[PDB]
Structure formats: structure tokens, C-alpha cells
Amino acid sequence: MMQIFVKTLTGKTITLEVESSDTIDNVKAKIQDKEGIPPDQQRLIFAGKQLEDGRTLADYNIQKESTLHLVLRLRGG
């Protein structure tokens, strides 16, 4: 179980609790509850690097309360 701080585009950094062997897909599902933006255009960028969509939290060697900044891609409107 890994606790992480994900920083939405709204600037709000929420504490998201997921499994260590879980996937970024579930992280997006927590984020979409806050941002309301589907996982299709929301991407995760940690330390200035994009993380593969769906990777395990422990894969990038994340620790408790690490900061994950997300970037939204332009959605057609």
C-alpha cells in the first residue's frame, strides 16, 4: 500500500491511497473524481518526466507522499 500526493491541474494536491503493485490507471480514477477529466487526456508527469500510463507505483520507486504532477492534453470541444 502506497500513499502518494498527486497534484491536480487545479493545484490541489490530494492524498491518494493505492496499492504498491497497483497501476496508474487506478490513480487516474481518483483524480477524475476530483478533476472530472477522463483518464484519456490526463497524463502523469513526475520529476519532469512522463510516466507510462498504467505502471506500478513501486516501478518508478515511489515512496510515501511523493508528489505527482499531472498534465492535461487538449481535448476537442
Q: What does this entry look like structurally?
A:
The protein is an alpha+beta fold. It has one domain: Roll (Ubiquitin-like (UB roll)), CATH 3.10.20.90. 16% of the residues lie in helices and 34% in strands. It contains one helix and five strands. The protein has one helix at 24-35; strands at residues 2-7, 13-18, 42-46, 49-50, 66-72. A five-stranded mixed sheet has the order 2-1-5-3-4, with helices on one face. A hairpin with a 2-residue loop joins strand 3 and strand 4. The longest helix has 12 residues, at 24-35. It is globular and about 35 Å long. 18% of the residues are buried. The PDB classes it as plant protein. The entry lists the keywords ubiquitin, monomer, plant protein. The assembly is monomeric.
> How many discrete structural domains?
1
Q: Percent helix among the residues? A: 10-25%
Please state the second-level CATH architecture: Roll
CATH superfamily name? Answer: Phosphatidylinositol 3-kinase Catalytic Subunit, Chain A, domain 1
CATH class: Alpha Beta
Structural class estimated from helices and strands = alpha+beta
CATH topology: Ubiquitin-like (UB roll)
Distance between the termini: 38 Å
Strand content: 25-35%
Topology readout:
Blueprint: E1 2-7, E2 13-18, H1 24-35, E3 42-46, E4 49-50, E5 66-72
Parallel strand pairs: 1-5
Antiparallel strand pairs: 1-2, 3-4, 3-5
Task: Supply database-style keywords.
77 residues; alpha+beta; five-stranded mixed β-sheet; 16% helix; Ubiquitin
